[PDB]
Amino acid sequence: FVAAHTSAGKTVVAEYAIAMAHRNMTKTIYTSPIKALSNQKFRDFKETFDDVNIGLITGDVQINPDANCLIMTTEILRSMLYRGADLIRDVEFVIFDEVHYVNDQDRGVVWEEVIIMLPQHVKFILLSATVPNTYEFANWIGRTKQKNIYVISTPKRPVPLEINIWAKKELIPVINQNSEFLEANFRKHKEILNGSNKRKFFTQDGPSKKTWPEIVNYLRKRELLPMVVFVFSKKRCEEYADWLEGINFCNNKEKSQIHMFIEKSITRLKKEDRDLPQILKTRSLLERGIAVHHGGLLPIVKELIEILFSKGFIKVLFATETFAMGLNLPTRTVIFSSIRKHDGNGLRELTPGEFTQMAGRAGRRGLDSTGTVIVMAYNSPLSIATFKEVTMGVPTRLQSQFRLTYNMILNLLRIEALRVEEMIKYSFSENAKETLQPEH
Amino acid sequence: SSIQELYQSLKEITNNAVELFEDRITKLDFEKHANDIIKDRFLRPSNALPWSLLDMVQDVPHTSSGKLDYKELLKVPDPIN
Amino acid sequence: SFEPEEIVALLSVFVYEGKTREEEPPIVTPRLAKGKQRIEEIYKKMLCVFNTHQIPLTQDEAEFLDRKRFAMMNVVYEWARGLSFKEIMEMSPEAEGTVVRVITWLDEICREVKTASIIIGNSTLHMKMSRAQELIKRDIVFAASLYL
Amino acid sequence: GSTAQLPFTPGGIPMKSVKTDSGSSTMANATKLLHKDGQGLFDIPEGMNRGIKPMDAE
Amino acid sequence: SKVFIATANAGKAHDADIFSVSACNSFTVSCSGDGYLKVWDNKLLDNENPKDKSYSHFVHKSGLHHVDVLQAIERDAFELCLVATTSFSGDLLFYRITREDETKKVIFEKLDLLDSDMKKHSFWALKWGASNDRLLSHRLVATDVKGTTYIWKFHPFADETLNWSPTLELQGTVESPMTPSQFATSVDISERGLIATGFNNGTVQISELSTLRPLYNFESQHSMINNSNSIRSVKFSPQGSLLAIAHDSNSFGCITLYETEFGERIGSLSVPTHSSQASLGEFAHSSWVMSLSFNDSGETLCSAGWDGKLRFWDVKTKERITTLNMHCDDIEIEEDILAVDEHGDSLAEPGVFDVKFLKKGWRSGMGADLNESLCCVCLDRSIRWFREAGGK
Amino acid sequence: KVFIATANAGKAHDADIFSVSACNSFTVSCSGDGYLKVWDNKLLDNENPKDKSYSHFVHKSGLHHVDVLQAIERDAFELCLVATTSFSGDLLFYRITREDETKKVIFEKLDLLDSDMKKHSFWALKWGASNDRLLSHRLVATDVKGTTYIWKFHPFADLNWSPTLELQGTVESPMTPSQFATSVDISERGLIATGFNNGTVQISELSTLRPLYNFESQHSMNNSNSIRSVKFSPQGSLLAIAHDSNSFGCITLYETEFGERIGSLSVPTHSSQASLGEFAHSSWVMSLSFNDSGETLCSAGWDGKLRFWDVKTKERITTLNMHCDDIEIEEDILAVDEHGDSLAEPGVFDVKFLKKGWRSGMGADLNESLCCVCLDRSIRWFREAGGK
Amino acid sequence: VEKLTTASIALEQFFKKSPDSQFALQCALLTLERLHHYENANELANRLIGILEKKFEKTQDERELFNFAIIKGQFARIHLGLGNFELSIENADLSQGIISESSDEKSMKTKISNHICLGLSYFFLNDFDQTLNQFQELLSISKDSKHLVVLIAKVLYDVGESDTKEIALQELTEYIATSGADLLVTLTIAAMSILDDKREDLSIILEELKALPLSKQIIDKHKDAPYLIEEITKRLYRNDTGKQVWQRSAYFFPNNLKVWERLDKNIQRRIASNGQNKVTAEEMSKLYCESKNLRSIQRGMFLCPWNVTAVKALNECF
């Protein structure tokens, strides 16, 4: 059970997952909830390893039928244990990607329905963002399954970073490379920040159209490239992008290279699909220098953008939350434009885990291991307690994922082997299972 | 006329020496034979039979010539090893 | 009574979030409207039956009918005919990636239903499902995976 | 493939199906539960209630 | 295996319609109604349609409708590679390869093998053969108006290091066994040696080439129309004993699976295709079907239709994996696009003539290892290529 | 209430008269023989319309559809444009102008579209008469494939005569495989009603070339599913369609926004054998036409009877048998013999309303006028109301 | 057609998986009859006939003589236009002795089946006048139905003589009174009267041939008799007003093929280019040829080389 951080050598377990299995003659499944990630880590597996039979399952049909190392979605994984698949015989060590999703209810109940319902011979290999509740999770899956495990933690980052605040074009360091809370600088920033009716947009927050290039160009004189910015709203991403002008990250040769590379991507589709307005704009942006990444963009637009950025060409980027889950990363700096977002319910501050997943991504590894981070503030005071619960605060504990889907119930009552009650009472919610069942 | 001779008349013509492509049009009259379709096509009787006059074909008895008549497939599982 | 296109578009109601500010346009054909009505009725019935027992549903399932899911019928129907991606985009209100995702999930559904259709019996239904599964799977909807 | 063919084993949770023998109690409450009339002549197919009627009906 | 995607494209290749394609490890070449040969190179540069890496050659005035290439390695004296093409008149002109790496000046020899007497028989559906020391003659089967098959043993080498002496020959004359006299539509050999023959009335008669043996035949599937059942392409699995027949049925296409020994129809390769609006039946494609092809293993079958649709049929279990749709707008560069033909018809669903597989290490344009690549040609004078996802 | 007859011109053409459009001064008439014939509306009551007939042989294959557009733009340029499509599927334009003194109608031909577009096989077409919504005028046309061609017509272009047809758009086929487009119509509000041969009606908005919605056939089974004549109410959103069953005529009506149905026009009772199929005409409905005032709708069937339908009432106003003499009384019902058709067997082709007084006489300007064409080639003109 | 083919294949496979049953062999050769599979009609009817070798000293009551008699009519139906006409003779006499003097439903089915094949055997093969015509004379009172004269009218004219022409005249006229308002019959009358060129007959028919009910027109697909109005005009008057019925009928049914080709080749081709209406590979090829150019002709040739006209065109063009 790996409790570590991304962009800090988490693939060490993924490297020996196949390398052990390929010599010893077992198989391995890499199980990621996001489809983009599946493609990403597939690419990674193609790259790093030396002649390995890799595979990836999609809706239409499987790429590489006779694969040694398959890749699949959690839903598709679940569809082995109910259907009776070929590769639950051959697989021994199943890899599990990102089990800090173990808190989220709406999607992540599949992990309870698969990990607890795995076969007897199959054993656990996990990968996750750091959490304080380490002992309780692994031991639970250990105790119920009756499998020996160790808490392989990674409490502090071997690839660290520093965190700053933006105010009147300034870098005010609240936290440095060694993770020391500077109380004086926080005092400093607020002391600096001491008839406009709402005709268009809200009266305060969201900066002017010639602020963004000021933010950009100032960092390019100091030369803290590459940088990334995290804008949430899909309209606002576009808006905050299109205000920028006079800025090109590729020379006339590299521009031509970009043109050629896009020309491959476009070749797949029809002329009607090639000449989309969205793709035209995208083409312009890539040629211009920068790019955008939100879920509202198309599959061919997103993945391509991710590649071209990760090639090391685009050094200023605008992107969503899900973008943080990537493969290759040229980022010396990561910036938060806002700390507000609308995840289903309403206005809610981003949880410390989310802060980590995003801000902890800012390290390079193999150039400058101490990464830069700067949070934006547009002529307004920061809420100290909230800020520190986001910045310093602990990523909250793993909360149980129970959601009785009727399909599951129908499957179980059809199959009848392993009855539903037995599943239910022994499920993740603890009660004389992990703690103190000998005293019964 | 036979197909063979027609095939052969075209096969006698050799290559041409333009490189370039050229488009030659046929000289075929689509249109003497006025009484071809009139005195044959309609009044000639059916070589096969029309499905309108395939009503006197069969009758379908219920009994085959019971219980064992329906279930011929009934059987014990395969030999145990 | 429906055609494959009509079926697949009808099935879009389930595989879409339906949280947006803009208004729903008029429905593309009366049969689809009828189908929608039927669906609404069935979901009302289900809500009633759940409500007698007094068990709390999820925020998604509690909302369902209140949420703006029904506009994507008019969207995907045209795609199911055999139309350009710009034309459909200029009909629809929502972003393009979202639409693509919805289309994908409809492929998943038609697959799921196809098996079930076979199981139940009606071969015409299965054919319709597979007619839909033929038409929707093309071009940008299932483009290249650029990570090979 | 298909959900028709039944799946493989689950680990950890006890699937309760012990034989308990080296009759006595091998088929315990299996044929004993479904037992009614006439020296074990099982009239009804189990799950439902109906019975059987000989050739004299029609 | 799942879904293929555009590795390379081209457009407006020949002046008339491109009726067939002929691909191999070294190069690919297409034949057409104006009657020329453009030998397209396999090794390209990164992200570019070559065009100028396909040197044209003059052949015939009437045209060229079917073509195929063969490659071999008999000895170190000469790396063998040979091409032959059929015309509308019906003369099988051979074309000997002699390549250079830098210049690429592949000029052919003036090859007139047969005398004037043997050319009484036409040459319509040619098909080369790859014999790895089963029978020393490099096999080759053709058809004609009279219904006959001829072979030509072309060995330039010595002893039945190796002195130059190219020749022509005959293994055995297999005629049309069925009565009355008939037009031989298409024919193809197999690796095992069981070499069946197809006809224009729906029947496929099983046979052998060397022994002059007609084995057995079977009845067609519903044949009462004028052109009831016309067999377009008979094909075989490279390893197995199966037989994939491609034939027509008024408007629709029909693909059937058999086996060599038994000759029993376990099933016809069909899916829910459009037919009579609501009440469907069972056909391969909605329109006609021409060219079938297997991959290197002999599992995934790929048919080429008249409605601008490729469909991947799984042979091991008769069911379609997926469908690739062909349009005029798929062409890459703007100048070569032909949306509508000269006589007024939109080419959104053009007639796909000849699909043909390219096994492990044949194509390598961009992002392809030891891949099972594919090629295709359509009614709108276009030529396109596809590839397997990943490879390894 | 009742429609008095003004005049009727017998033995007009050699072959059948298919379509018959009208304008301020004259009624244009196409035909199967190949002549374009204009007929004067300004008639002196007691006169045969042959006296003011002007023929022009255009194409030997014949003309099935023709459409007219009379209007003014700059100062007082009397632009009369007659566009037509032959049996060969060839589009031709003609500007019609008379001499100053003699008053002889000169058929000046126009080849506005290039040979690449004239190549395509057209069928039905119509002129959308603009009112400065578009800069100049609009034109629509169907084809064999269903790719409905639309043209932004300009007569002037820097004022001096310089006619050009810039392509607005091409609304592609509704279903794959395609259908033969049978009829077409365009409204002032800006909707494109495209009719097809399998009971399908594709509705497309004019601006973005986008399909708004479409209907399907009422018949689910073939027993004449095809569309006859799509038609719009001039300003209002009410949309009229005609389709058949097994040798009958059925009118269907919908709204132009929501697509909710409003009324199938029918006549019940016993002489139709109880009648499960509530239909309008005993034979195919060959033509539909709204009057220019809006309310009231004409309907011509192959059976002979011109039925008039009030859209407010959703019921028939009156009948008028054009070919055979059947006036005065009216025991109104669809005649259905047990074989198939009615005992009444004339040959109607087309009917059309004309605006309040394009004719001249007693029945003129007081009333609206009515035009119609038959198989015997006796083109007719009828006055209306009879209460002034 | 598809369904029947599926049934047939299913039967065939069954006969290789698990052959020899009671009712399977009895009702398996009827699908073939329906689909017109005359090549392998007696390929596995040897198994039926062969199996009836053990039913002479076994049944003999109301099974071996009724079933085999039913099968005898079937046999007659099969062997007729295959190769030899001599099989039509005594195969009819199997069912004649069994249930001519019997009277039943089964016997009715058997009786009228034997009336068909013998009439078309002695004239078409042997060239016998009264050998066929005597058996097709007592037929007169066979069975009063609406499809009696549908077949028999065709039969009567094809003797190649004056006497039988008279018998056809007498037949058709006598049909007219009882029932004479059908499609196929009227069309055949119009064919016959076309070859006649009677002065009062052509006018009589052409007045009613133009006056067709619309249901009848709907029923028609290829438009054979609506076309032949032109022919009737040309042989009546010999004028230029023949091109008339084309313009009406075609206008009514715009997607109808052959009619619209006859008007113009470019229209029908454009209709069935990608594929709107139904067409075959030889007919498509013909269409391609008839455009009158090079590339199209080549395409047509590629599609179908076994038509003569395309080849002829090709020969002409070089």
From Swiss-Prot, chain C:
Disulfide cross-links: none
Subcellular localization: Cytoplasm
Extra remark beyond the main annotation: Present with 5770 molecules/cell in log phase SD medium.
Function (record text): RNA helicase component of the SKI complex involved in 3'-mRNA degradation pathway. Represses dsRNA virus propagation by specifically blocking translation of viral mRNAs, perhaps recognizing the absence of CAP or poly(A). Essential for cell growth only in the presence of M1 replicon.
Family designation: Belongs to the helicase family. SKI2 subfamily.
Subunit comment: Component of the SKI complex composed of at least SKI2, SKI3 and SKI8. The SKI complex interacts with SKI7, which makes the link between the SKI complex and the exosome in order to perform mRNA degradation.
Record protein name field: Antiviral helicase SKI2
Encoding gene per record: SKI2
Full-protein interval shown: 1140 to 1287 of 1287
UniProtKB/Swiss-Prot annotation, chain F:
Record flagged with keyword Aminoacyl-tRNA synthetase: no
GO CC entries: cytoplasm; nuclear chromosome; nucleus; Ski complex
Keywords in alphabetical order: Antiviral defense, Chromosome, Cytoplasm, Meiosis, Nucleus, Repeat, WD repeat
GO BP term, example: reciprocal meiotic recombination
Main localization (coarse): cytoplasm
Family membership: Belongs to the SKI8 family.
Misc note: Present with 1710 molecules/cell in log phase SD medium.
Protein's name according to its UniProt entry: Antiviral protein SKI8
Gene from which this protein is expressed: SKI8
Swiss-Prot record, chain G:
TPR repeats by residue range: 112-145
Source domain of life: Eukaryota
Localization: Cytoplasm; Nucleus
Residue runs in coiled coils: none
Additional notes on this entry: Present with 11900 molecules/cell in log phase SD medium.
Cited function: Component of the SKI complex involved in 3'-mRNA degradation pathway. Represses dsRNA virus propagation by specifically blocking translation of viral mRNAs, perhaps recognizing the absence of CAP or poly(A). Essential for cell growth only in the presence of M1 replicon.
Family: Belongs to the SKI3 family.
Assembly, per entry: Component of the SKI complex composed of at least SKI2, SKI3 and SKI8. The SKI complex interacts with SKI7, which makes the link between the SKI complex and the exosome in order to perform mRNA degradation.
Name of the featured protein: Superkiller protein 3
Lineage, top ranks: Eukaryota, Fungi, Dikarya, Ascomycota, Saccharomycotina
Recorded name of the encoding gene: SKI3
Residues of the full protein shown: 1115 to 1432 of 1432
